[PDB]
Amino acid sequence: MIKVVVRKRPLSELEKKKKDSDIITVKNNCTLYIDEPRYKVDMTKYIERHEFIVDKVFDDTVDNFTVYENTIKPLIIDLYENGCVCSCFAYGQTGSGKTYTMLGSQPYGQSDTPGIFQYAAGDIFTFLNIYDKDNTKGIFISFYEIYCGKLYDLLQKKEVVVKDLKILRVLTKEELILKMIDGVLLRKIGVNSQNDESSRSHAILNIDLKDINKNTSLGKIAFIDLAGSERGADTVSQNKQTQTDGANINRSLLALKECIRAMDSDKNHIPFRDSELTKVLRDIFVGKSKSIMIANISPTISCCEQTLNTLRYSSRVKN
Known part of the structure; x- marks a missing residue:
């Protein structure tokens, strides 16, 4: 199953100075409007309102902790209580808030504004201590980039097949967070030397709870x-x-x-x-x-076509 939520980011400082307009109106918990400026039937100004309905919409005042508690915390509870296979996707155009949602503000790890990943790491280890006091269970991660259909290990540049990816045991939330941050930053440098390679590739961090002796x-x-x-x-x-x-x-x-x-x-x-x-x-x-997709959207007129594409895609996957 999958829940699809939309998150509107607020105008940046720069966007406000250029006097960009915010065209996104969040009506309630499930509904939002995009007001697109058009020039039709001749060439004069009017607004087409496109309304979209999803599972949940977070407006531009909702912080990362609130996103975390609503979306990811239920998944970690499922993992530990039920043995659930879980996923969280970040979807949207470059600049829409995917990375800010996951990790907070830059510099990562130095800033006082963490993302959903740091909050998740904390609860993953708190739950581990509830579910295990005998060092019989452990957390094991893999982290890799998919670029042009091939895999690149971000815990290590040469391509790898899945079975050759490094699997690392992590013992604290700090270590898990450091490995996520460093992998994101490595992808930002461009492992294949491509311009903005992070925007032009996928990244997957897998967190597996295993029975250490059975290796299951x-x-x-x-x-x-x-x-x-x-x-x-x-x-x-x-x-x-x-x-x-x-x-x-x-x-x-x-x-x-x-x-x-x-x-x-x-x-x-x-x-x-x-x-x-x-x-x-x-x-x-x-x-x-149990899966969730967070669809991030930018609020400006210049992003309108892509924001509409994102919201249309988000409507079709909920089907």
Whole structure:
């Protein structure tokens, strides 16, 4: 199953100075309007209101702790109580707030404004201490980038297959947070030397609770930071690498939509082989899993086309 929530980020300082308008109106808990300025039937100013309804909308005043408690805390409870396979996706255009949602403000780890990941790490270890006082269970992570359909280990530049990814035992929340931060920053430098590689790749951090002696899973949660939803525009680039990331991002994001839709209905056969992204994530599409997608949106006029694309996509996956 999957819950789809939308988070509106507030105008930045710079956006306010350029006197950008905020075109997003959050009506209530489940509803929001996008007011798009158009010039039609001639060429004069009017507003088309597009209304969207989702599971939950967070307006631009909702902080990260509140997002965490609402979205992720129930998943960690499921993991520990029920042995649930869980996932949290961040979806939206570059600049919409995916990274701020996950990790808070820069510099990461130095700032007093953490993201949902740090709050999650704290509760993962508190729960571990409730569920184990005998050092019989442990937390084991993998973290990797998917770029142009291939995997790159962010706990380590050369491609790897899934079975060769480093699996690391982590003993405290601080260690888990440091490994997440350092992996995000490594992807930001560009492991394949591509410009804004983080926007043009997916990243997946898997947190697995294991019975240490049996080496079996007792539940897990994956955090997935998707490629920029606008980046399928890269497919027209005359730079061959950039063209390839565009085709791959289009394919992976469509594949993800199909797999979520199959899961939510036509459920016998999940088309996980449609993309490398869905193939590595195949375990999340199996009915008893618990997933959330946070769809981040930017509030300005210049982002209107992409904000509409994001909200349309968010409507189709809820199906």
